[PDB]
Design an enzyme around this catalytic site. Sequence first.
Site, PDB file in Angstrom:
ATOM      1  N   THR A  57      97.691  36.403  50.458  1.00 28.50           N
ATOM      2  CA  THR A  57      96.876  36.422  51.760  1.00 28.50           C
ATOM      3  C   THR A  57      96.986  37.545  52.535  1.00 28.50           C
ATOM      4  O   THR A  57      96.433  37.766  53.571  1.00 28.50           O
ATOM      5  CB  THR A  57      97.101  35.029  52.649  1.00 28.50           C
ATOM      6  OG1 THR A  57      98.919  34.851  52.655  1.00 28.50           O
ATOM      7  CG2 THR A  57      96.674  33.674  52.068  1.00 28.50           C
ATOM      8  N   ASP A  76      81.542  48.247  27.492  1.00 26.62           N
ATOM      9  CA  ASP A  76      82.027  49.716  27.930  1.00 26.62           C
ATOM     10  C   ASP A  76      82.268  50.845  26.677  1.00 26.62           C
ATOM     11  O   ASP A  76      81.438  50.739  25.788  1.00 26.62           O
ATOM     12  CB  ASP A  76      83.560  49.375  28.627  1.00 26.62           C
ATOM     13  CG  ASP A  76      83.728  50.353  29.591  1.00 26.62           C
ATOM     14  OD1 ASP A  76      84.001  51.413  29.243  1.00 26.62           O
ATOM     15  OD2 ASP A  76      83.945  49.703  30.967  1.00 26.62           O
ATOM     16  N   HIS A 130      88.337  54.572  29.250  1.00 28.62           N
ATOM     17  CA  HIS A 130      88.096  53.792  30.256  1.00 28.62           C
ATOM     18  C   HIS A 130      87.771  52.160  29.841  1.00 28.62           C
ATOM     19  O   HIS A 130      88.251  51.196  30.649  1.00 28.62           O
ATOM     20  CB  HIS A 130      86.647  54.455  31.318  1.00 28.62           C
ATOM     21  CG  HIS A 130      85.454  53.630  31.037  1.00 28.62           C
ATOM     22  ND1 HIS A 130      85.119  52.732  31.740  1.00 28.62           N
ATOM     23  CD2 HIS A 130      84.245  54.142  30.260  1.00 28.62           C
ATOM     24  CE1 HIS A 130      83.738  52.214  31.482  1.00 28.62           C
ATOM     25  NE2 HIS A 130      83.303  53.298  30.663  1.00 28.62           N
ATOM     26  N   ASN A 162      79.668  53.931  42.187  1.00 28.86           N
ATOM     27  CA  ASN A 162      80.744  54.668  43.061  1.00 28.86           C
ATOM     28  C   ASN A 162      79.971  55.793  44.100  1.00 28.86           C
ATOM     29  O   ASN A 162      80.562  56.906  43.928  1.00 28.86           O
ATOM     30  CB  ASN A 162      81.657  55.336  42.049  1.00 28.86           C
ATOM     31  CG  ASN A 162      82.522  54.037  41.140  1.00 28.86           C
ATOM     32  OD1 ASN A 162      82.646  53.332  41.651  1.00 28.86           O
ATOM     33  ND2 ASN A 162      82.821  54.567  40.090  1.00 28.86           N
ATOM     34  N   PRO A 213      70.439  40.080  41.424  1.00 31.99           N
ATOM     35  CA  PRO A 213      70.731  39.047  42.261  1.00 31.99           C
ATOM     36  C   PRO A 213      71.619  37.956  41.571  1.00 31.99           C
ATOM     37  O   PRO A 213      72.671  37.496  42.286  1.00 31.99           O
ATOM     38  CB  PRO A 213      69.654  38.290  42.899  1.00 31.99           C
ATOM     39  CG  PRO A 213      68.513  39.352  42.745  1.00 31.99           C
ATOM     40  CD  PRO A 213      68.725  40.095  41.556  1.00 31.99           C
ATOM     41  N   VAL A 241      74.057  37.938  38.933  1.00 35.41           N
ATOM     42  CA  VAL A 241      74.982  38.313  38.560  1.00 35.41           C
ATOM     43  C   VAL A 241      76.254  38.478  39.695  1.00 35.41           C
ATOM     44  O   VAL A 241      75.736  38.618  41.018  1.00 35.41           O
ATOM     45  CB  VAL A 241      75.083  39.460  37.552  1.00 35.41           C
ATOM     46  CG1 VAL A 241      74.216  39.274  36.447  1.00 35.41           C
ATOM     47  CG2 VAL A 241      74.744  40.610  38.229  1.00 35.41           C
ATOM     48  N   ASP A 276      78.765  40.649  46.071  1.00 39.80           N
ATOM     49  CA  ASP A 276      79.065  39.256  46.400  1.00 39.80           C
ATOM     50  C   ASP A 276      80.485  39.468  46.513  1.00 39.80           C
ATOM     51  O   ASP A 276      81.045  38.253  47.281  1.00 39.80           O
ATOM     52  CB  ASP A 276      78.883  38.658  45.036  1.00 39.80           C
ATOM     53  CG  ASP A 276      77.363  38.720  44.325  1.00 39.80           C
ATOM     54  OD1 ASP A 276      76.539  37.871  45.102  1.00 39.80           O
ATOM     55  OD2 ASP A 276      77.108  39.550  43.597  1.00 39.80           O
ATOM     56  N   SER A 318      84.490  50.269  38.592  1.00 36.12           N
ATOM     57  CA  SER A 318      85.021  50.073  37.375  1.00 36.12           C
ATOM     58  C   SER A 318      86.397  49.329  37.281  1.00 36.12           C
ATOM     59  O   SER A 318      86.228  48.565  36.458  1.00 36.12           O
ATOM     60  CB  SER A 318      84.964  51.198  36.493  1.00 36.12           C
ATOM     61  OG  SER A 318      85.214  50.671  35.268  1.00 36.12           O
ATOM     62  N   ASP A 323      88.972  40.446  56.077  1.00 39.59           N
ATOM     63  CA  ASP A 323      90.357  41.179  56.059  1.00 39.59           C
ATOM     64  C   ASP A 323      90.203  42.858  55.556  1.00 39.59           C
ATOM     65  O   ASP A 323      90.949  43.480  55.791  1.00 39.59           O
ATOM     66  CB  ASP A 323      91.220  40.693  55.185  1.00 39.59           C
ATOM     67  CG  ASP A 323      91.691  39.397  55.595  1.00 39.59           C
ATOM     68  OD1 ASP A 323      91.705  38.925  56.760  1.00 39.59           O
ATOM     69  OD2 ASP A 323      91.817  38.484  54.657  1.00 39.59           O
TER      70      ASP A 323
HETATM   71 CA   LIG Z   1      74.996  37.810  43.132  1.00 45.31          CA
END
Ligand SMILES: [Ca+2]
Length: 279
Positions: free
Chosen positions: A16, A39, A69, A161, A175, A177, A200, A224, A260
């Site tokens: 938290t 990837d 990566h 990025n 939208p 995912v 999200d 990533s 936060d």
């Molecule tokens: Ca979404």
Amino acid sequence: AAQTNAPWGLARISSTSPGTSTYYYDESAGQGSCVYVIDTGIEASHPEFEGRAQMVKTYYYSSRDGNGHGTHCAGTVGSRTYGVAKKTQLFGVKVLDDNGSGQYSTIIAGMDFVASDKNNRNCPKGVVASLSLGGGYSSSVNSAAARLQSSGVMVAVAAGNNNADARNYSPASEPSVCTVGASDRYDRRSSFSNYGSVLDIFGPGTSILSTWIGGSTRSISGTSMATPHVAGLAAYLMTLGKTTAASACRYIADTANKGDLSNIPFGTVNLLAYNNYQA
Ligand SMILES: [Ca+2]
């Protein structure tokens, strides 16, 4: 379970508050779930994967990760030391070449591959896909990600990025995912992280220690890196029976640390991935 001196991102996902160093998680640890890492591949022989990683598909002359990566991302999902879901099965799909590049047609093929391939795997607790890649807006790329999600896979994708609105990038802008931004260890939005209404959730993305090729380890930064924290979290939560592939993004947002993060632009969610584990 408690892992002392964990990478900061793991500690953050079970806290938290920022500024702690122990990762707390239920011992089930994603056992019985599977995560596809789409990837540059995964170095399956890395001791950190403990035999739980395998390459299942490549579109290039080798399935070897000659970049690192993909191996780094896989490590954040499920390596013993650096992973969120330390008992998940990891499946590598190499859609990016060793320079980290890939044609959209190949990426789309890889997504459709996963939607079918899960029927050839044993993942009784559920299936996740981690997509730490992206480019400019493409309706075809977005549609592929939407199909993968619709097929019953929890899809987590990097926001990108560009320090820009993710609406202009794919698959970030799809939208249906789970689009993941990056934060740093002081709860600031990572300087490079995309933002916008299409995000999200945020996960740890700055200075993330994980596995690398040649049996090594490495700290790197990016959305990533944030994406596999969320993918691993989904696998972990699905094993606990808390959620399913179709609702995991909503569940993660519902249970996130709220308000936060700093430097979140007006209109972007202020939500940081959190496992809500009570030791
Ligand atoms: Ca979404």
